[PDB]
Symmetry: C3
Subunit: 162 residues, 3 copies
């Protein structure tokens, strides 16, 4: 007869799926939970290409984020507003100029930066004294780079942490 | 005949558990290794909520760390002492002032920071010339933020990297 | 003789477990199959992250297509415009020096650096007209805050995982 891991029903003998496992006519497979950073293909189980977002939200204890080709931002609500930790992507960094980082269309307050040559400075922590991060709120920013004078003007919306 | 994936005892045919798999009367499940960043629920396999710690320890090749609601820090022992890489959490950052970062009650020797307006500065690397990181000793710090002038005097105990 | 259903298959060798995505089936039993290049491992203790998964995470963070890593520094390179810009993290207590001749890609000196302030530690480094590619050289000087050690290193670029 059948015992551990197998079961008998009207359909005959089958493999009984437990936690992390799917059983179908396509075989016994690993089941990955959506939004927890893994994928599974015919090559096997692995990290997906956005697992790093969950990691950075954990790092900063952020509850909302944005990510596009040129910047990502991890927002923490505290006191009367929000402070976010910024990482450049694709070669870009985030401008620290007065009008260049808006949350819910509100201009930022204090920024902490890293420093380049001349007047170059890259925003790494950005705060809004009286504006909160929330899902669906707009984030409008200007990114810059060190090769050309091109400014990247992006408008995206906040997403809840995974 | 029962063949690959199955095993036979006097009690019948069962699924044989290989690496990463557990088999019980309740079925075939994924087995995750405790300290390696994954979890398994009825919803499937995923990263757990502290996998980011392993990632950051790997990033800096750190052997000890701390994490609380205000800050996390990753320590590398080298020469006669140690150097730590600092990340703010929850919107906070670490004061870089002379008496504001202690390891085992010893004041730091050197700090590298990111810079804000006026005297605002956030510690990003902190070094002690002759104090070693080890599990069970205290890290004391002053957390601050960009919205209010409130400070948090914190104390958190070092833990071995996972 | 047999009435087999989901998860099982029957061949001339008998009834066996049918392997789907993420599963391997052998005489040693049913095991998890990890995609070895995507940061996971499987041992007798179970499935977990391997010790280079952090590199995949950091390439994702910066959308980098090449990197270097040694025990003193890691760098994540993004090709854009006519050149390359890289994001820099210290390792082992070290940091990347920001002097003019201290950071070369394919033997070419950088054009711009962004840094943290101490002493200064480079966090972003850029080359106007040099591209990142696998196998080319990254030559740098690493420093630390305890001693005056000058680590002159040369390391080779690796394709992002
Ligand atoms: N990470």
């Amino acid at each position: 007869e059948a015992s551990k891991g197998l079961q008998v029903t009207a359909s005959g003998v089958s493999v009984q799926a437990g936690d992390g496992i799917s059983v179908a006519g396509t075989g016994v497979a690993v089941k990955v939970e959506a939004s927890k950073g893994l994928q599974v293909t015919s090559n096997g189980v692995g990290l997906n290409n956005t697992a790093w977002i969950k990691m950075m939200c954990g790092l900063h204890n952020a509850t909302f984020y944005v990510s596009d080709t040129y910047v990502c931002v991890f927002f923490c609500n505290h006191s009367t507003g929000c402070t976010a930790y910024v990482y450049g992507r694709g070669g870009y960094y985030l401008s620290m100029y007065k009008g260049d980082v808006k949350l819910n269309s509100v201009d930022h307050n204090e920024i902490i930066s890293m420093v380049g040559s001349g007047s170059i400075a890259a925003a790494t922590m950005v705060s809004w004294k009286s504006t909160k991060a929330a899902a669906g709120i707009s984030f409008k920013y200007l990114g810059k780079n060190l090769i050309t004078s091109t400014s990247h003007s992006g408008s995206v919306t906040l997403v809840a942490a995974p």
